[PDB]
Amino acid sequence: AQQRSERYVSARSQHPAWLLLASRRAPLVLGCLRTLFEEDALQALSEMLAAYASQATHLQAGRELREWIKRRLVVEREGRIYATDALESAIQFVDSLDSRIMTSTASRLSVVQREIENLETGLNPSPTGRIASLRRRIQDLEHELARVEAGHVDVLDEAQAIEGMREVYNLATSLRADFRRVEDSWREADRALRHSIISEHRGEIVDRLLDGQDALLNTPEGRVFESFQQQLRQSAELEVMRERLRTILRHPAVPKALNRPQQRELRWLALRLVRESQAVLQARARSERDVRGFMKTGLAAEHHRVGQLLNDFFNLALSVDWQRQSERRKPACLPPVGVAITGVPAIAFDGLDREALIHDTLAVLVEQGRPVSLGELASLLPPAHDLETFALWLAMAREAGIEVLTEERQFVELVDEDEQRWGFNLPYVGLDHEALKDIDW
């Protein structure tokens, strides 16, 4: 009994999912992670954490992400973040607290009894009992056929149909729970293999493994997945199953049992399962290819020796005084590598941009904080193109609802690049920041 307590203590100390449960900001993190799986992740996490001060932002988000990566909650391959089984387990536990489909049903008992009978019949090697069981089943089927031909077609009740639908959905949707587990097992097997190779470096083992074309990364989960997908490759029963499901879906009791998302999930079981099964073979192939490429490099002995030397240096580094500037600035002995030259031998595009102009005009309006007409705005911010700007200001004024007067004229003199003069007979406008502060552009 105490062994259970010790194991619980160890699990609380170690398992990353429980640590995520114990995290203070678990709700936001879980919401973000669940939404994403349906670099930029840091952006989304910071944006979500923004309007949740209550109770840095970028720095704290990065620190949390790196801590979780160190905790192996998520993995990083080249530039992308990928999930593990623990994330899905935690998500399931969290969202299961709302509503759970009951299993203690008579229909489940019937299915269990049928499966038990099937197992007991299948495991028997006797050639006589199987024949007797087949005869009994045929006799029972003939009795049922005679009773049906007597006019006793049995139609189940409403509650019975609802319970059957719910149980079928519950049992069917559980096929996709083990996918990440196989990938995690393959990754950990690959890491163990690389550690063994580097620890060993012996070239004979590398040559033998490269010569051998046998599949590496052998785990029982791989064999189970292979058998499952091999039986899944037979579409003959898949078509019948899909047709039966689509026939079932057209029943008046459906809206009373399953919501829209459940019906959508049930409608496309077969193709989705096939595609998901296919999606793992590419990952296995890439893992094997990367392992073989790493083996062909033949630098394991080099890395082993350099690691040993670095460990020796870092062991020596604990016997020096880093509190002295003179010692820290004492030159060492390292030849110059990659020495460059000694500096010298000692001898109608572009057009117009709108966003920048809008932002600068907004900044001027907010900094001045007073009504401004077109003349002053032109003076403070001389334009490159005289047109395409007056129109923009007038459009902003009209859209914002700020009134524009046309009975009076303001004369603005502009000079282009090639000298000369132009005069604009603009009407009068007054621009303020407060009115237009809440309109997108």
Binding site: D386, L387, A391, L394, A395, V404, N425
Partner: peptide, 30 residues
């Protein structure tokens, strides 16, 4: 094409609509 327009034009009329109403404004240059 406002760049080419400015070469061979001497006036402009801007039409803007807000809500279900519209309005016109006149300009010039020289």
């Amino acid at each position: 094409e406002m760049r080419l327009l400015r070469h061979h034009t001497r006036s402009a009329v801007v039409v803007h609509r807000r809500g279900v109403e519209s309005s016109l404004v006149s300009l010039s240059w020289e």
